[PDB]
PDB file of C-alpha atoms and ligand atoms in Angstrom:
ATOM      1  CA  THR R 194     127.663  87.749 110.171  1.00 56.78           C
ATOM      2  CA  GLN R 195     125.739  84.579 109.139  1.00 56.98           C
ATOM      3  CA  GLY R 196     124.971  84.448 105.348  1.00 60.00           C
ATOM      4  CA  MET R 197     124.501  87.722 103.299  1.00 60.91           C
ATOM      5  CA  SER R 198     124.963  91.398 104.362  1.00 60.95           C
ATOM      6  CA  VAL R 199     121.721  93.052 103.378  1.00 60.61           C
ATOM      7  CA  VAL R 200     121.130  96.614 103.766  1.00 61.16           C
ATOM      8  CA  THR R 201     117.732  98.515 103.454  1.00 60.27           C
ATOM      9  CA  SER R 202     116.666 102.115 103.215  1.00 62.05           C
ATOM     10  CA  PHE R 203     113.576 102.482 105.620  1.00 60.81           C
ATOM     11  CA  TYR R 204     111.145 100.678 107.475  1.00 62.72           C
ATOM     12  CA  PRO R 205     108.937  98.939 104.895  1.00 59.84           C
ATOM     13  CA  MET R 206     112.007  97.861 102.900  1.00 57.21           C
ATOM     14  CA  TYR R 207     113.629  96.572 106.149  1.00 59.18           C
ATOM     15  CA  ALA R 208     110.485  94.618 107.337  1.00 59.56           C
ATOM     16  CA  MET R 209     109.556  92.972 104.099  1.00 57.50           C
ATOM     17  CA  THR R 210     113.172  91.807 103.365  1.00 58.17           C
ATOM     18  CA  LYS R 211     113.312  90.681 107.007  1.00 61.18           C
ATOM     19  CA  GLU R 212     110.321  88.666 106.847  1.00 64.87           C
ATOM     20  CA  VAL R 213     111.143  87.158 103.476  1.00 65.43           C
ATOM     21  CA  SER R 214     114.724  86.570 104.375  1.00 66.25           C
ATOM     22  CA  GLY R 215     113.556  84.776 107.406  1.00 67.16           C
ATOM     23  CA  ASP R 216     116.474  83.640 109.652  1.00 65.84           C
ATOM     24  CA  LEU R 217     118.879  83.144 107.055  1.00 66.87           C
ATOM     25  CA  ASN R 218     120.809  86.602 106.499  1.00 71.22           C
ATOM     26  CA  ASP R 219     121.922  89.722 108.274  1.00 70.99           C
ATOM     27  CA  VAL R 220     119.329  92.160 107.689  1.00 72.87           C
ATOM     28  CA  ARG R 221     119.788  95.968 108.703  1.00 71.42           C
ATOM     29  CA  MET R 222     118.320  99.392 108.153  1.00 70.66           C
ATOM     30  CA  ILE R 223     120.001 102.899 107.210  1.00 72.97           C
ATOM     31  CA  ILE R 224     112.583 109.808 104.555  1.00 72.95           C
ATOM     32  CA  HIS R 225     111.398 112.093 101.760  1.00 76.80           C
ATOM     33  CA  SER R 226     114.147 114.593 102.491  1.00 76.10           C
ATOM     34  CA  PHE R 227     116.919 112.066 103.663  1.00 74.10           C
ATOM     35  CA  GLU R 228     120.359 111.913 102.351  1.00 72.97           C
ATOM     36  CA  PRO R 229     122.679 109.104 103.288  1.00 74.84           C
ATOM     37  CA  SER R 230     125.368 109.921 105.560  1.00 74.16           C
ATOM     38  CA  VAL R 231     129.139 108.962 104.667  1.00 76.93           C
ATOM     39  CA  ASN R 232     128.574 106.202 106.859  1.00 78.01           C
ATOM     40  CA  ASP R 233     125.304 104.842 105.447  1.00 75.44           C
ATOM     41  CA  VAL R 234     126.937 105.116 101.871  1.00 75.22           C
ATOM     42  CA  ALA R 235     130.139 103.060 103.126  1.00 74.67           C
ATOM     43  CA  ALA R 236     127.934 100.552 104.672  1.00 73.14           C
ATOM     44  CA  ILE R 237     125.783 100.189 101.339  1.00 73.18           C
ATOM     45  CA  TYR R 238     129.033  99.559  99.247  1.00 72.98           C
ATOM     46  CA  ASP R 239     130.185  97.044 101.948  1.00 69.15           C
ATOM     47  CA  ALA R 240     126.878  95.046 101.647  1.00 69.64           C
ATOM     48  CA  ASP R 241     125.932  92.142  99.379  1.00 71.51           C
ATOM     49  CA  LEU R 242     122.384  93.764  99.080  1.00 70.86           C
ATOM     50  CA  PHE R 243     121.031  97.022  99.388  1.00 70.23           C
ATOM     51  CA  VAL R 244     117.450  97.131  99.115  1.00 70.78           C
ATOM     52  CA  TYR R 245     115.444 100.384  98.369  1.00 70.37           C
ATOM     53  CA  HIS R 246     111.781 101.037  97.124  1.00 71.86           C
ATOM     54  CA  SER R 247     111.755 103.483  93.959  1.00 72.08           C
ATOM     55  CA  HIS R 248     114.125 105.961  92.672  1.00 71.95           C
ATOM     56  CA  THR R 249     110.972 108.350  92.820  1.00 71.79           C
ATOM     57  CA  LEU R 250     111.628 107.996  96.793  1.00 70.20           C
ATOM     58  CA  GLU R 251     115.117 107.425  97.732  1.00 70.44           C
ATOM     59  CA  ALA R 252     116.491 109.368  94.404  1.00 69.78           C
ATOM     60  CA  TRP R 253     119.978 109.107  95.929  1.00 67.17           C
ATOM     61  CA  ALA R 254     120.063 105.286  95.206  1.00 70.55           C
ATOM     62  CA  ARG R 255     120.828 106.216  91.531  1.00 66.96           C
ATOM     63  CA  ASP R 256     123.911 108.220  92.477  1.00 65.65           C
ATOM     64  CA  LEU R 257     125.302 105.067  93.910  1.00 64.95           C
ATOM     65  CA  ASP R 258     128.156 103.897  91.739  1.00 63.66           C
ATOM     66  CA  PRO R 259     129.523 100.335  92.992  1.00 62.82           C
ATOM     67  CA  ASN R 260     131.499 100.331  89.754  1.00 64.04           C
ATOM     68  CA  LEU R 261     133.860 103.183  90.778  1.00 66.13           C
ATOM     69  CA  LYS R 262     134.170 102.142  94.374  1.00 64.89           C
ATOM     70  CA  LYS R 263     135.114  98.712  93.259  1.00 65.11           C
ATOM     71  CA  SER R 264     132.276  97.308  95.467  1.00 66.02           C
ATOM     72  CA  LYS R 265     130.146  94.250  94.349  1.00 66.35           C
ATOM     73  CA  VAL R 266     126.984  95.554  96.215  1.00 63.70           C
ATOM     74  CA  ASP R 267     123.654  94.779  94.342  1.00 63.80           C
ATOM     75  CA  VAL R 268     121.662  97.908  94.251  1.00 62.02           C
ATOM     76  CA  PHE R 269     118.037  96.699  94.077  1.00 64.68           C
ATOM     77  CA  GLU R 270     114.896  98.691  93.331  1.00 66.24           C
ATOM     78  CA  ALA R 271     112.232  96.811  94.920  1.00 67.15           C
ATOM     79  CA  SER R 272     109.241  98.373  93.397  1.00 70.39           C
ATOM     80  CA  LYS R 273     110.428  98.120  89.639  1.00 68.13           C
ATOM     81  CA  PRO R 274     107.393  95.679  88.638  1.00 68.70           C
ATOM     82  CA  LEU R 275     104.946  97.911  90.294  1.00 72.04           C
ATOM     83  CA  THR R 276     103.018 100.577  88.131  1.00 72.19           C
ATOM     84  CA  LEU R 277     102.790 103.822  90.151  1.00 72.41           C
ATOM     85  CA  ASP R 278     100.246 106.510  89.727  1.00 77.59           C
ATOM     86  CA  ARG R 279     100.950 109.921  88.785  1.00 75.62           C
ATOM     87  CA  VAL R 280     100.581 112.842  91.347  1.00 73.45           C
ATOM     88  CA  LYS R 281      97.641 113.574  91.685  1.00 76.78           C
ATOM     89  CA  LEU R 282     106.035 112.811  89.421  1.00 77.14           C
ATOM     90  CA  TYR R 283     104.389 109.817  90.633  1.00 77.35           C
ATOM     91  CA  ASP R 284     103.053 108.837  94.180  1.00 77.46           C
ATOM     92  CA  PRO R 285     105.689 106.389  95.646  1.00 76.69           C
ATOM     93  CA  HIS R 286     103.611 105.143  98.653  1.00 77.45           C
ATOM     94  CA  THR R 287     102.334 101.807  97.414  1.00 74.57           C
ATOM     95  CA  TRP R 288     103.368  99.982 100.566  1.00 77.35           C
ATOM     96  CA  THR R 289     100.296 100.875 102.493  1.00 80.89           C
ATOM     97  CA  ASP R 290      98.010  98.870 100.021  1.00 82.37           C
ATOM     98  CA  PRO R 291      98.487  95.327 101.549  1.00 83.78           C
ATOM     99  CA  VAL R 292      98.270  93.744  97.962  1.00 83.30           C
ATOM    100  CA  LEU R 293     101.068  95.950  96.611  1.00 85.92           C
ATOM    101  CA  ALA R 294     103.315  95.366  99.726  1.00 82.23           C
ATOM    102  CA  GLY R 295     102.726  91.803  98.747  1.00 80.95           C
ATOM    103  CA  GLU R 296     103.845  92.065  95.129  1.00 80.84           C
ATOM    104  CA  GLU R 297     106.898  94.004  96.441  1.00 78.47           C
ATOM    105  CA  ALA R 298     107.931  91.279  99.317  1.00 78.19           C
ATOM    106  CA  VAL R 299     107.540  88.733  96.483  1.00 73.91           C
ATOM    107  CA  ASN R 300     109.745  90.652  94.156  1.00 78.25           C
ATOM    108  CA  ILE R 301     112.265  90.978  97.213  1.00 81.05           C
ATOM    109  CA  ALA R 302     112.415  87.241  97.591  1.00 79.51           C
ATOM    110  CA  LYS R 303     113.077  86.774  93.900  1.00 82.20           C
ATOM    111  CA  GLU R 304     116.357  88.811  94.481  1.00 76.53           C
ATOM    112  CA  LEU R 305     117.258  87.315  97.596  1.00 75.92           C
ATOM    113  CA  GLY R 306     117.347  84.014  95.532  1.00 76.84           C
ATOM    114  CA  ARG R 307     119.354  85.253  92.771  1.00 75.59           C
ATOM    115  CA  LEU R 308     122.020  86.296  95.244  1.00 76.39           C
ATOM    116  CA  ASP R 309     121.762  83.012  96.951  1.00 75.34           C
ATOM    117  CA  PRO R 310     120.351  80.057  95.258  1.00 74.54           C
ATOM    118  CA  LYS R 311     120.748  77.441  97.693  1.00 76.44           C
ATOM    119  CA  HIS R 312     117.942  78.937  99.682  1.00 75.09           C
ATOM    120  CA  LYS R 313     115.692  80.123  96.710  1.00 73.21           C
ATOM    121  CA  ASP R 314     112.834  77.959  97.728  1.00 70.62           C
ATOM    122  CA  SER R 315     113.093  79.376 101.189  1.00 72.11           C
ATOM    123  CA  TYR R 316     112.843  82.914 100.345  1.00 69.98           C
ATOM    124  CA  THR R 317     109.839  81.998  97.950  1.00 71.91           C
ATOM    125  CA  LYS R 318     107.889  80.285 100.917  1.00 70.07           C
ATOM    126  CA  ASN R 319     108.479  83.181 103.028  1.00 70.51           C
ATOM    127  CA  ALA R 320     107.121  85.613 100.436  1.00 70.26           C
ATOM    128  CA  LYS R 321     104.121  83.278  99.845  1.00 69.21           C
ATOM    129  CA  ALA R 322     103.211  83.339 103.336  1.00 69.94           C
ATOM    130  CA  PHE R 323     103.397  87.080 103.564  1.00 71.43           C
ATOM    131  CA  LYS R 324     101.480  87.423 100.440  1.00 69.63           C
ATOM    132  CA  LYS R 325      98.964  85.045 101.462  1.00 69.52           C
ATOM    133  CA  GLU R 326      98.782  87.053 104.912  1.00 70.50           C
ATOM    134  CA  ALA R 327      98.119  90.286 102.888  1.00 69.11           C
ATOM    135  CA  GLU R 328      95.305  88.900 101.041  1.00 73.81           C
ATOM    136  CA  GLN R 329      93.583  87.906 104.223  1.00 73.90           C
ATOM    137  CA  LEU R 330      94.116  91.397 105.381  1.00 73.76           C
ATOM    138  CA  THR R 331      92.527  92.999 102.144  1.00 73.17           C
ATOM    139  CA  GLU R 332      89.634  90.997 102.480  1.00 72.96           C
ATOM    140  CA  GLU R 333      89.081  91.483 105.967  1.00 73.43           C
ATOM    141  CA  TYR R 334      89.007  95.170 105.336  1.00 74.57           C
ATOM    142  CA  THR R 335      87.263  95.108 102.299  1.00 75.83           C
ATOM    143  CA  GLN R 336      84.244  93.789 104.277  1.00 76.41           C
ATOM    144  CA  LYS R 337      84.803  96.209 106.965  1.00 76.73           C
ATOM    145  CA  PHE R 338      84.858  99.218 104.818  1.00 79.65           C
ATOM    146  CA  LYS R 339      81.907  98.640 102.927  1.00 80.72           C
ATOM    147  CA  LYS R 340      79.927  99.182 106.122  1.00 81.65           C
ATOM    148  CA  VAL R 341      81.249 102.302 107.480  1.00 79.59           C
ATOM    149  CA  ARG R 342      79.272 105.686 108.072  1.00 80.63           C
ATOM    150  CA  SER R 343      82.192 107.870 106.652  1.00 81.28           C
ATOM    151  CA  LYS R 344      84.457 106.763 103.718  1.00 80.16           C
ATOM    152  CA  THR R 345      86.519 109.827 103.475  1.00 77.79           C
ATOM    153  CA  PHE R 346      89.506 111.058 105.751  1.00 76.67           C
ATOM    154  CA  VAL R 347      92.123 113.519 106.041  1.00 75.82           C
ATOM    155  CA  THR R 348      95.933 112.908 106.669  1.00 75.76           C
ATOM    156  CA  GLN R 349      98.868 114.873 107.630  1.00 73.21           C
ATOM    157  CA  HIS R 350     100.421 113.935 104.268  1.00 73.56           C
ATOM    158  CA  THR R 351      99.422 112.339 100.958  1.00 70.78           C
ATOM    159  CA  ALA R 352     100.535 108.798 101.853  1.00 71.05           C
ATOM    160  CA  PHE R 353      97.607 106.640 101.855  1.00 69.58           C
ATOM    161  CA  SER R 354      96.257 107.229  98.209  1.00 68.88           C
ATOM    162  CA  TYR R 355      96.909 103.461  97.592  1.00 68.51           C
ATOM    163  CA  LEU R 356      95.247 102.136 100.611  1.00 70.92           C
ATOM    164  CA  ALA R 357      92.474 104.505  99.652  1.00 69.28           C
ATOM    165  CA  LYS R 358      91.855 103.214  96.200  1.00 70.55           C
ATOM    166  CA  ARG R 359      92.124  99.589  97.399  1.00 71.89           C
ATOM    167  CA  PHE R 360      89.422 100.072 100.049  1.00 73.51           C
ATOM    168  CA  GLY R 361      86.879 102.249  98.082  1.00 74.68           C
ATOM    169  CA  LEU R 362      88.003 105.244 100.428  1.00 74.25           C
ATOM    170  CA  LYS R 363      88.618 108.803  99.797  1.00 73.13           C
ATOM    171  CA  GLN R 364      91.721 110.853 101.052  1.00 75.33           C
ATOM    172  CA  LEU R 365      93.331 114.198 101.214  1.00 76.24           C
ATOM    173  CA  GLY R 366      96.657 115.060 102.322  1.00 78.32           C
ATOM    174  CA  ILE R 367      97.170 118.361 104.355  1.00 75.75           C
ATOM    175  CA  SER R 368     100.727 118.301 102.840  1.00 77.10           C
ATOM    176  CA  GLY R 369     101.254 116.629  99.384  1.00 78.58           C
ATOM    177  CA  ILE R 370     103.664 113.706  98.485  1.00 82.41           C
ATOM    178  CA  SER R 371     106.285 115.093 100.900  1.00 82.36           C
ATOM    179  CA  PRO R 372     105.693 116.595 104.363  1.00 79.73           C
ATOM    180  CA  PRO R 373     100.235 124.047 102.767  1.00 80.89           C
ATOM    181  CA  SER R 374      99.600 127.861 101.670  1.00 82.08           C
ATOM    182  CA  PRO R 375      96.734 129.766 103.226  1.00 83.36           C
ATOM    183  CA  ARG R 376      94.556 129.024 100.143  1.00 82.43           C
ATOM    184  CA  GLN R 377      95.383 125.194 100.776  1.00 78.29           C
ATOM    185  CA  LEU R 378      94.382 125.382 104.460  1.00 78.79           C
ATOM    186  CA  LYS R 379      91.080 127.003 103.157  1.00 75.57           C
ATOM    187  CA  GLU R 380      90.690 124.178 100.692  1.00 76.09           C
ATOM    188  CA  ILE R 381      91.316 121.603 103.238  1.00 76.28           C
ATOM    189  CA  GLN R 382      88.851 122.942 105.522  1.00 71.30           C
ATOM    190  CA  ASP R 383      86.323 122.969 102.746  1.00 73.00           C
ATOM    191  CA  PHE R 384      87.026 119.429 101.659  1.00 70.80           C
ATOM    192  CA  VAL R 385      86.397 118.287 105.452  1.00 72.58           C
ATOM    193  CA  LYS R 386      83.063 119.977 105.299  1.00 74.25           C
ATOM    194  CA  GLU R 387      81.918 119.154 101.882  1.00 73.63           C
ATOM    195  CA  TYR R 388      82.688 115.475 102.713  1.00 71.82           C
ATOM    196  CA  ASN R 389      81.820 115.941 106.448  1.00 69.58           C
ATOM    197  CA  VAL R 390      85.040 114.298 107.808  1.00 70.76           C
ATOM    198  CA  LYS R 391      85.170 113.530 111.554  1.00 68.15           C
ATOM    199  CA  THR R 392      88.766 112.940 112.013  1.00 64.91           C
ATOM    200  CA  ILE R 393      92.191 114.446 111.090  1.00 62.23           C
ATOM    201  CA  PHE R 394      94.901 112.076 111.083  1.00 63.89           C
ATOM    202  CA  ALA R 395      98.322 113.442 112.416  1.00 62.11           C
ATOM    203  CA  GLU R 396     101.395 111.376 112.122  1.00 61.28           C
ATOM    204  CA  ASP R 397     104.050 111.109 115.112  1.00 59.07           C
ATOM    205  CA  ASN R 398     107.172 112.971 114.195  1.00 59.76           C
ATOM    206  CA  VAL R 399     105.384 115.746 112.265  1.00 58.80           C
ATOM    207  CA  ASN R 400     104.174 118.695 114.348  1.00 59.04           C
ATOM    208  CA  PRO R 401     100.521 118.402 114.764  1.00 59.41           C
ATOM    209  CA  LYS R 402      99.611 121.997 115.445  1.00 59.09           C
ATOM    210  CA  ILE R 403      98.064 122.409 111.873  1.00 59.36           C
ATOM    211  CA  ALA R 404      95.847 119.328 112.050  1.00 57.24           C
ATOM    212  CA  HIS R 405      94.706 120.281 115.446  1.00 56.57           C
ATOM    213  CA  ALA R 406      93.721 123.868 114.198  1.00 57.86           C
ATOM    214  CA  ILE R 407      92.039 122.404 111.103  1.00 56.19           C
ATOM    215  CA  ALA R 408      90.234 119.833 113.449  1.00 57.35           C
ATOM    216  CA  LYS R 409      89.286 122.592 115.964  1.00 56.30           C
ATOM    217  CA  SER R 410      88.020 125.009 113.499  1.00 55.84           C
ATOM    218  CA  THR R 411      85.818 122.234 111.796  1.00 55.81           C
ATOM    219  CA  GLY R 412      84.530 120.235 114.584  1.00 58.32           C
ATOM    220  CA  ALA R 413      86.772 117.183 113.711  1.00 61.87           C
ATOM    221  CA  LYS R 414      88.965 114.916 116.313  1.00 59.56           C
ATOM    222  CA  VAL R 415      92.717 114.608 115.681  1.00 62.64           C
ATOM    223  CA  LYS R 416      94.050 111.094 115.630  1.00 58.98           C
ATOM    224  CA  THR R 417      97.211 109.225 114.544  1.00 57.04           C
ATOM    225  CA  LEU R 418      97.762 107.114 111.526  1.00 57.06           C
ATOM    226  CA  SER R 419     101.299 106.010 110.532  1.00 56.00           C
ATOM    227  CA  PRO R 420     102.521 105.776 106.797  1.00 56.94           C
ATOM    228  CA  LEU R 421     105.025 103.283 108.083  1.00 58.26           C
ATOM    229  CA  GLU R 422     107.630 105.438 106.989  1.00 61.06           C
ATOM    230  CA  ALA R 423     109.372 105.583 110.348  1.00 58.65           C
ATOM    231  CA  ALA R 424     109.829 102.455 111.957  1.00 59.46           C
ATOM    232  CA  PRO R 425     107.080 101.541 114.702  1.00 57.81           C
ATOM    233  CA  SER R 426     107.531 100.896 118.244  1.00 56.93           C
ATOM    234  CA  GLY R 427     107.131  97.246 119.177  1.00 55.39           C
ATOM    235  CA  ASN R 428     107.900  93.935 117.786  1.00 57.50           C
ATOM    236  CA  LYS R 429     105.090  93.521 115.135  1.00 57.47           C
ATOM    237  CA  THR R 430     105.682  92.002 111.532  1.00 59.42           C
ATOM    238  CA  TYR R 431     105.216  94.603 108.906  1.00 58.75           C
ATOM    239  CA  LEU R 432     101.587  93.507 108.189  1.00 59.28           C
ATOM    240  CA  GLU R 433     100.582  93.489 112.125  1.00 60.70           C
ATOM    241  CA  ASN R 434     101.574  96.962 111.921  1.00 62.19           C
ATOM    242  CA  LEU R 435      99.808  97.845 108.612  1.00 61.63           C
ATOM    243  CA  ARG R 436      96.733  95.887 110.187  1.00 60.67           C
ATOM    244  CA  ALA R 437      96.689  98.133 113.542  1.00 63.23           C
ATOM    245  CA  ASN R 438      96.484 101.271 111.271  1.00 61.18           C
ATOM    246  CA  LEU R 439      93.882 100.019 108.934  1.00 60.15           C
ATOM    247  CA  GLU R 440      92.152  99.354 112.436  1.00 63.53           C
ATOM    248  CA  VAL R 441      92.654 102.933 113.650  1.00 65.83           C
ATOM    249  CA  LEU R 442      91.101 104.004 110.175  1.00 67.15           C
ATOM    250  CA  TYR R 443      88.092 101.977 110.557  1.00 65.15           C
ATOM    251  CA  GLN R 444      87.470 102.524 114.268  1.00 64.67           C
ATOM    252  CA  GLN R 445      87.322 106.121 113.172  1.00 62.38           C
ATOM    253  CA  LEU R 446      85.155 105.783 110.040  1.00 65.24           C
ATOM    254  CA  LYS R 447      82.800 103.298 111.746  1.00 65.21           C
TER     255      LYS R 447
HETATM  256 ZN1   ZN G 559     105.348 109.818 102.470  1.00 69.16          ZN
END
């Protein structure tokens, strides 16, 4: 409507762009196994800016060909300047590390500014505030995590490896990069005991029966920890949502 038409692949892309773009543009949203519908694709070609995270995640972003469709959408890989770790094929889940969520918002600002130079400074300022909020979050939880009685946890999938590097914590996913054999089940329960883990973290929108069973047979409590891959209910900013989840983690490792 007003300003540029911006499309994004999934919640962390949507929320970072939205906060960095402030009230200037039109920001909309369209995961490991997701293919765009014919409507999604049409709406990408129709946009000025489509923001996705990594071709290691939304692999389909590469099949887009604005040249053929005589469209002028700018296909934009927001995590390019980020070094990704190998599994562990790379682990895409950088967004749950507050610092790295920062670098990526800063990057999305840069691109918005290329597309629309008049408000360049404005994108920049919003990115800086986001960055500086991410750093207050990193610090607060750097303090909090060095005084917990349990530094290890298990999550429904391997989505928190970056969050875990950042806070000196150890994680294991029941599934891997994407949402487990009989051996793996056994290995997970052994990991739980070797490290004495008191909470298995399910995620909403993935069937929790396997986490409950592991927890049951292992003396551990199931709880919920969101990779922020699906959009959260409510009206919190990206980092408010990331904070609430760091805090579930700490309440449980406390
Ligand atoms: Zn994931």
